[PDB]
C-alpha cells in the first residue's frame, strides 16, 4: 500500500489468540447443572464411547462438556464446574468438567497425575 | 528535485550493473553538488560538464540557449571485478522528507536507528542537505548543522 493508504488505515493484520471458551465469559470456570449425560462417537478415524454431558451454566449458556477420567458419577441435576478445553475428536464439545469439584467425584483409584483428576494423596 | 535525485540514484545503479565507464546525469545545481561529493569521496573517477552528446573537451558557457541540452558526465570506477559504487538510495523520499537535528545525526552515525533510518555502515556515505548545500553527515556534525538526510551511497 502507498504511504497515504497506510495513513488511511492500511496495515498488517494483528496476531492475537482468540477465545475458545466464549460461554465462560472470560472466567476460569463457571458452575452449572447437568441437563443430560450422554455418550458420543468420535469422528473418524477414532472409535470409542466418549462420555459427555450437557450443562446449563450459571450465566444461562448451555454447553457440552467432556467428562475426563475412567468412570464418573455424574447424573442429571448434578452440580458441576466447567472449565475451558475442547474434546478434539468430539465436534461441539468445547469444555471440560472438573473432576473432584461439586458433585463430580475424583477418578477412583487414580495414582498418576492425581491433581488433574481430583484424586487426593493416599496416606 | 528529490525526484530527479531518485532518478539519478537508480540510473547509477543500472550503469554499474552493466559496467559502463561513462554516463550522463541531468545538469542542475543539486545534481552537480551530489556528483561532486561522490567524486571527492572516491566513488566517481571523473566529473565533467557537457552536452547530450558527450562531455565537453573545452569550456562551453551555459546559457538559456543551450541549458536544455546540458548534461553532467561522470566516470564510474571498478576494481577487482567489483563496482566501487554498488548501491545508491535515497533516505529522504519525495513523499516523506526527513529532517534531523545534529543530535540525531550523531546517533545515526553511532549505530542507533533514527526514524527507521538504518545506521551508517562501514565504508558508506550518507549525504545531508543544509541551506541548499550537500555535505557528508560527518561534516554536518562538525559544523553543528541541522539538515535533511538525502541519500546513502555504498
Amino acid at each position: 500500500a502507498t504511504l497515504n493508504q497506510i495513513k488511511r488505515g492500511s496495515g498488517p493484520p494483528r496476531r492475537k489468540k482468540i477465545s475458545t471458551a466464549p460461554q465462560l465469559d472470560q472466567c476460569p470456570q463457571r458452575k452449572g447443572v447437568v441437563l443430560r449425560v450422554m455418550v458420543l462417537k468420535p469422528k473418524k478415524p477414532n472409535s470409542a464411547q466418549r462420555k459427555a454431558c450437557r450443562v446449563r451454566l450459571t450465566n444461562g449458556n448451555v454447553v457440552s462438556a467432556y467428562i475426563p477420567g475412567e468412570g464418573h458419577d455424574a447424573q442429571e441435576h448434578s452440580i458441576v464446574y466447567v472449565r475451558g478445553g475442547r474434546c478434539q475428536d468430539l465436534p461441539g464439545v468445547k469444555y471440560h468438567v472438573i473432576r473432584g469439584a461439586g458433585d463430580l467425584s475424583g477418578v477412583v483409584n487414580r495414582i498418576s497425575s492425581r491433581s488433574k483428576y481430583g484424586a487426593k494423596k493416599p496416606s | 528535485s528529490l525526484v530527479k535525485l531518485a532518478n539519478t540514484c537508480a540510473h547509477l545503479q543500472n550503469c554499474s550493473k552493466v559496467r559502463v565507464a561513462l554516463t550522463s546525469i541531468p545538469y542542475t545545481k543539486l545534481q552537480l553538488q551530489f556528483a561532486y561529493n561522490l567524486y571527492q569521496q572516491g566513488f566517481l573517477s571523473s566529473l565533467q560538464k557537457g552536452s547530450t552528446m558527450g562531455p565537453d573537451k573545452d569550456f562551453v558557457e551555459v546559457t538559456p540557449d543551450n541549458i536544455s541540452t546540458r548534461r553532467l558526465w561522470v566516470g564510474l570506477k571498478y576494481r577487482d571485478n567489483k563496482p566501487v559504487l554498488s548501491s545508491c538510495k535515497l533516505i529522504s523520499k519525495p513523499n516523506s522528507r526527513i529532517h534531523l537535528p545534529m543530535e540525531d545525526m550523531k546517533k545515526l552515525c553511532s549505530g542507533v536507528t533514527i526514524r527507521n533510518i538504518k545506521p551508517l555502515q562501514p565504508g558508506e556515505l550518507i549525504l545531508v542537505r543544509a541551506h541548499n548545500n550537500i555535505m557528508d553527515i560527518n561534516e554536518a556534525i562538525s559544523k553543528k548543522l541541522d539538515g535533511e538526510v538525502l541519500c546513502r551511497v555504498k
Binding site: - | 569521496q41 572516491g42 566513488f43 570506477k77 576494481r79 577487482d80 567489483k82 566501487v84 538504518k118 555502515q121 562501514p122 565504508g123 558508506e124
Partner: protein, 102 residues
C-alpha cells in the same frame, strides 16, 4: 571457501541478502555479543569462525535455502575495509581500535 571476517569475529557491517525466497538480515555485533541468529545460521557461523552476530530471517525459513543463502551472503555481500579503501582511494579507520592503540 574463505569468508571475510572483521577482526576474525564478525562480519563487515550489515547484510540484507535475498537468496530465492529467503530474506536474510544480518547485523554485525560487539565483541562478546555471541551468536543470536537462526539455528541454521548459528551452526554455519560456528564452523566459519564467526563469534558475534545478530540477524533475522524473513519470508521463507527453509533450512536448506538459509544455509546456502548465508554462505552466499558471507562472500558476495561483504567488502573488507581494505577493499573499500583501495577502490575509493581513501583511508578507513576503526575508531574503536585506534582508541586503544599506543
Amino acid at each position: 571457501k574463505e569468508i571475510p571476517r572483521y577482526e576474525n569475529r564478525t562480519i563487515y557491517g550489515d547484510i540484507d541478502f535475498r537468496y530465492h525466497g529467503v530474506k536474510l538480515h544480518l547485523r554485525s555485533a560487539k565483541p562478546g555479543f555471541g551468536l543470536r541468529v537462526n539455528h541454521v545460521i548459528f551452526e554455519i557461523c560456528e564452523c566459519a569462525g564467526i563469534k558475534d552476530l545478530s540477524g533475522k530471517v524473513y519470508k521463507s525459513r527453509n533450512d536448506m535455502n538459509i544455509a546456502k543463502g548465508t554462505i552466499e551472503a558471507f562472500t558476495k555481500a561483504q567488502k573488507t575495509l581494505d577493499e573499500v579503501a583501495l577502490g575509493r582511494g581513501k583511508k578507513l579507520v576503526d575508531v574503536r581500535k585506534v582508541y586503544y592503540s599506543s
